[PDB]
Amino acid sequence: NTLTVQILDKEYCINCPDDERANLESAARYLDGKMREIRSSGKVIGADRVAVMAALNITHDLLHRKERLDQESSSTRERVRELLDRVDRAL
Template sequence: MTQPNTVNVQILDKEYCISCPQDERANLESAARYLDGKMREIRTSGKVIGADRVAVMAALNITHDLLHKQQRLDLQADSTREQVRDLLDRVDEALATDPDEARS
């Protein structure tokens, strides 16, 4: 029986009832499907035995992916900031140029 602010999800053949605001329901269900898929991949590989260990390995893999993507985003943001600074410098330089000197 589902209460108004709970969602039932299945992860590795086990059902969990989780409290969740209505507007986050779709995100929670998506996250549960993603986690279930990662855990199934790890379990299928046969290298890790036991649901607890599979869960920890899935958490480590997901966290690694998240941190790697965050690092890439940080590098892209730094690059974008540098490009914006360069463009602003060029605009400042162009505006500082005396129009009479440019005609000579």
């Protein structure tokens, strides 16, 4: 089974099991989008570098999302401990 995605004005026929089609298609869409932004600036010159840079930003995006989530959890933990102290001091 072949999936044919379009990434940055070029075509790719990838042997993909029906199982992963949607996943691969959105991954391609996501990569395409990120490559379009990068290309539409000028810092990166070279179609191969654009792709590599995109993969690195996508990697950053996800690492940062996890960092933000971890911070969000830790914070509510601090607030929960603040609640606990209020409870111990008066009730």
